Amino acid sequence: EFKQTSSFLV
Amino acid sequence: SMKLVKFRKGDSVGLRLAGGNDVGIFVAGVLEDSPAAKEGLEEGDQILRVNNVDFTNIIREEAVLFLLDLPKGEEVTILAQKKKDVYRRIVESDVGDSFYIRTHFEYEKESPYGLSFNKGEVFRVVDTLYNGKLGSWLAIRIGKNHKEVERGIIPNKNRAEQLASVQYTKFPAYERVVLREAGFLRPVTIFGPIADVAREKLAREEPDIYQIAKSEPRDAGTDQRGIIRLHTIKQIIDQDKHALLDVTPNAVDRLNYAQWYPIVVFLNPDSKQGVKTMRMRLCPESRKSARKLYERSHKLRKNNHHLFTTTINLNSMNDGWYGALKEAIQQQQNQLVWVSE
Helix, strand or coil: CCCCCCCCCC | CEEEEEEECECECCEEEEEECCCEEEEEEECCCCHHHHCCCCCCEEEEEECCEECCCCCHHHHHHHHHHCCCCCEEEEEEEECHHHHHHHCCCCCCCCEEEEECCCECCCCCCECCECCCCEEEEEECCHHHCCCEEEEEEECHHHCEEEEEEEECHHHHHHHHCCCCCCCCCEEEEEEEECCCCCCEEEECCCHHHHHHHHHHHCCCCEEECCCCCCCCCCCCCCCCCHHHHHHHHCCCCEEEECCCHHHHHHHHHCCCCCEEEEEECCCHHHHHHHHHHHCCCCCCCHHHHHHHHHHHHHHHHHHCCEEEECCCCCCHHHHHHHHHHHHHHHCEEEEEC
């Protein structure tokens, strides 16, 4: 549980 | 070895961000073909600086909004560095953001993975882009003994300041805090049905350490019972003595805001009868009703417990509370205090 995950494309 | 890249922005800069303020903002991925991909940038690179702005201690949400806010058609310069040794270990562990906040509003969890809170609770924020989107912060509750008791999602500051506006303090919804040692003698507020006896007692018996702060005149049409000025308090602090304050809960909050963080002791009553028994023993003259005094402290605990720094349970049969108050005060004095950053 609770992985960080990349931001959307900026 | 550093890289310094220079390119124009078109629609987006073309980067996915990982990490945060505790480790660095890292490039989690590059969109293909893009001018950023053209100029060398790749996965595993730490973004050190963008344009004129330092990215080495920026929270992830802030970095994302900054790159979003950059005008298209205009020139972007980026200092970066390949640090695969560290980006790889940003994947094994959650690690990204780390800083502390204080809540200045009540929130009820919108999900079982959420965290609820009252005013005055402190949190270590570990992720400013939960699930890679904006909306929530991942955070850890901090309470007794400064320990990490619970982990879960909360609103980001933007939604928080907005959720908090539906209560119209000088305080923001989330304030950045950090642990400091009081480099001065903290003012002391005492609540409960024995507070007035306690203030007089402390000042009378221990005048070398403690001093009562004088009340300003009474405002017309109130209750016939006055505020205290920051100047009156400051002048007592000015001579290594604890200022004893007979003030309202809001005055305590204004005092918290002006970074004077008073030691706030609630003397918790035994019962209605126990209050009378203590009254009879300590102030048999006083005309104050034991009934009202007991209801006042419960009403005050009901609505302002977040302002309490410590609590002492009153035992009517003895005056052990006094010795316990002396020690509680000195204890609180040597404590670390969560202070505005």
